Design a protein around this ligand. Structure first.
Ligand SMILES: CN(C)C(=O)c1ccc2c(c1)c(Oc1c(Cl)cccc1C(F)(F)F)nn2-c1ccc(C(=O)O)cc1
Length: 244
């Protein structure tokens, strides 16, 4: 009739562990390297690469980032304990939204640059892709998320919830997911209360804004994959087979 703290704390620690063990670079690396910016002629060299050459670097970086999120989902309590159809559903709808959220770590809102291939640069680095609106939309959204000053525990718990969402169309075991969700919600709210950050709940990006930016992103990557497929060693082949 009253909440159990030890279980909640165990869940928080476990999510935050899985998150740490499934990030490309640690937040410390990205933050120190902030002063390491692309020179004007390094910029130039990227701008003079062909559309398809930039696409394959970007697509590879993006696919690897989806793989890391797949890994994160497999390590979450109960996810592996859940039917294959449901796992695919959660990941098909969710993994790229998590990737887009993770980006805020690599983004510096001070000079509006991101870390790409060892150094920081603005959106002009990607000019050969001819994806101006989309890239600026991505930058805008990272800039929005930056103004929240997430900790890594916050990103961990929040991206866990972006993924574990019982409203995704086509789930079978819906009640199991609701339960994993509610537990994640108690874990997140607990942690935020501990750190005096509860007031960020109401400031999180509206759900519709994450969805739209993801739809736009994915629509674009699909056209590019049709026009110039990159070749991928699938880590979750039944998920992969549903999109490629
Ligand atoms: C559709 N959507 C809303 C998602 O959240 C979602 C989920 C998984 C995605 C992708 C997107 C996705 O996007 C890509 C990437 Cl990263 C690179 C080239 C093409 C695409 C895609 F065509 F949009 F699917 N790969 N991709 C992916 C990458 C690798 C594996 C694998 O190794 O098993 C599986 C899926």
């Amino acid at each position: 009739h009253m909440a159990s703290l030890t279980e909640i704390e165990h869940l928080v620690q476990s999510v935050c562990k899985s998150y740490r063990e499934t990030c490309q670079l640690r937040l410390e690396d990205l933050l120190r390297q902030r002063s390491n910016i692309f020179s004007r002629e390094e910029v130039t060299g990227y701008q003079r690469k062909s559309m398809w050459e930039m696409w394959e670097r970007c697509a590879h970086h993006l696919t690897e980032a989806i793989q890391y999120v797949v890994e994160f989902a497999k390590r979450l309590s109960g996810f592996m304990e859940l039917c294959q159809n449901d796992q695919i559903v959660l990941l098909k709808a969710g993994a790229m939204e998590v990737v887009l959220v993770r980006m805020c770590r690599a983004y510096n809102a001070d000079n509006r640059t991101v870390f790409f291939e060892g150094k920081y640069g603005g959106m002009e680095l990607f000019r050969a892709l001819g994806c101006s609106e989309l890239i600026s939309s991505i930058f805008d959204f990272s800039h929005s998320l930056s103004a929240l000053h997430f900790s890594e525990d916050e990103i961990a718990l929040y991206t866990a919830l972006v993924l574990i969402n019982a409203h995704r169309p086509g789930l079978q075991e819906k009640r199991k997911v609701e339960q994993l969700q509610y537990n994640l919600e108690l874990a997140f709210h607990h942690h935020l209360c501990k750190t005096h950050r509860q007031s960020i709940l109401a400031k999180l990006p509206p759900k519709g804004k994450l969805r739209s930016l993801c739809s736009q992103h994915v629509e674009r990557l699909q056209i590019f994959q049709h026009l110039h497929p990159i070749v991928v060693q699938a880590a979750f082949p039944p998920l992969y087979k549903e999109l490629f």
